[PDB]
Enzyme design. Structure first.
Site, PDB file in Angstrom:
ATOM      1  N   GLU A  30       0.793  -1.212   0.000  1.00 14.18           N
ATOM      2  CA  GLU A  30       0.000   0.000   0.000  1.00 14.18           C
ATOM      3  C   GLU A  30       0.836   1.278   0.000  1.00 14.18           C
ATOM      4  O   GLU A  30       0.310   2.334  -0.366  1.00 14.18           O
ATOM      5  CB  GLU A  30      -0.978   0.006   1.216  1.00 14.18           C
ATOM      6  CG  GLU A  30      -2.095  -1.000   1.011  1.00 14.18           C
ATOM      7  CD  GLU A  30      -2.928  -1.270   2.253  1.00 14.18           C
ATOM      8  OE1 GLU A  30      -2.650  -0.608   3.262  1.00 14.18           O
ATOM      9  OE2 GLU A  30      -3.835  -2.142   2.179  1.00 14.18           O
ATOM     10  N   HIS A 157     -10.557  -0.242  -6.047  1.00 12.15           N
ATOM     11  CA  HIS A 157     -11.906  -0.188  -5.483  1.00 12.15           C
ATOM     12  C   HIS A 157     -11.960   0.594  -4.175  1.00 12.15           C
ATOM     13  O   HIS A 157     -13.051   1.042  -3.781  1.00 12.15           O
ATOM     14  CB  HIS A 157     -12.424  -1.604  -5.259  1.00 12.15           C
ATOM     15  CG  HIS A 157     -11.589  -2.374  -4.309  1.00 12.15           C
ATOM     16  ND1 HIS A 157     -10.340  -2.861  -4.659  1.00 12.15           N
ATOM     17  CD2 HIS A 157     -11.770  -2.681  -3.000  1.00 12.15           C
ATOM     18  CE1 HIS A 157      -9.812  -3.462  -3.611  1.00 12.15           C
ATOM     19  NE2 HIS A 157     -10.650  -3.355  -2.590  1.00 12.15           N
TER      20      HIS A 157
END
Ligand SMILES: *[C@@H]1O[C@H](CO)[C@@H](O[C@@H]2O[C@H](CO)[C@@H](O[C@H]3O[C@H](CO)[C@@H](O)[C@H](O)[C@@H]3O)[C@H](O)[C@H]2NC(C)=O)[C@H](O)[C@H]1NC(C)=O
Ligand SMILES: [Cu+2]
Length: 223
Positions: A30, A157
């Site tokens: 991330e 998403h």
């Protein structure tokens, strides 16, 4: 959640984790500033492999994406959850020895990407619904020798804010034969190529509904 866990070359799967440095855990990276953005890594654990796969310049390899290392099927849920919409990307990096080089640093160039098409269908959906097959052309005009192949899917998403984008990547170890060396790519660094404020990294894919997408990173190298 997905893993690039084997490579197909000339119709033949080279084996689970054979020439592909695989993590055990299928969780994303991330932080685009982490050394782990290159070839995966901490907080994941990545296995080493001494196999270097020989590939003819100008031909395709196929990255095979699976939900887990134990996964044996090839239906969509065996590749990745269909919420995980985004681009697929692949890069090369010339190295002296593909079994020991880290991937971290400069030297990468982009050889494949698949963002969002006119029908609003994303690269990752083509892999999910295509038995996990991510086909990548090795350029004919590059210098022969040892390379890392970085194959990536980015799930957007949950990418309205940063952090939020989910980066799934693994590196394969190649020996490219038959290349002409006619062209020398300009290169980028990992970490470095992606930033948290890039329009393809920090993006709401729902509000408004997207009709054009900018894949992050440099433009595609071509011969
Ligand atoms: C070898 O790898 C190539 C990627 O590095 C791959 O090229 C890509 O192939 C797809 C489909 O085969 C093309 O996608 C589109 O084609 C038309 C419009 O161009 C659309 O109607 C389709 O829905 C599809 O999205 C890519 O544009 C194409 N990319 C490039 C740069 O050529 C080859 O297919 C791979 N070859 C083999 C034999 O697997
Ligand atoms: Cu996931």
């Amino acid at each position: 959640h997905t893993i690039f866990s084997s490579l197909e070359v000339n119709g033949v799967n080279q084996g689970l984790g054979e020439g592909v440095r695989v993590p055990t855990y299928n969780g994303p990276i991330e932080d685009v500033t982490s050394a782990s953005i290159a070839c995966n890594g901490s907080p994941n654990t990545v296995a080493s492999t001494s196999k270097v796969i020989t590939v003819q310049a100008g031909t395709n390899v196929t990255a095979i994406w699976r939900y887990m290392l134990s996964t044996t099927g090839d239906s969509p849920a065996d590749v990745m959850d269909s919420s995980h919409k985004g681009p697929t990307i692949a890069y090369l990096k010339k190295v002296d020895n593909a079994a020991t080089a880290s991937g971290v640093g400069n030297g990468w160039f982009k050889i494949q990407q698949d963002g969002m098409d006119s029908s609003g269908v994303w690269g990752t959906e083509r892999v999910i619904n295509g038995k996990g097959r991510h086909s990548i052309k090795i350029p004919e005009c590059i210098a022969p020798g040892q390379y890392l192949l970085r194959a990536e899917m980015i799930a957007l998403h949950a990418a309205s804010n940063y952090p939020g984008a989910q980066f799934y990547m693994e590196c394969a170890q190649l020996n490219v034969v038959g290349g002409t060396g006619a062209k020398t790519p300009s290169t980028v660094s990992f970490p470095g190529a992606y930033s948290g404020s890039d329009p393809g990294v920090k993006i709401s894919i729902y509000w408004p509904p997207v009709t054009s997408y900018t894949v992050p990173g440099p433009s595609v190298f071509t011969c």
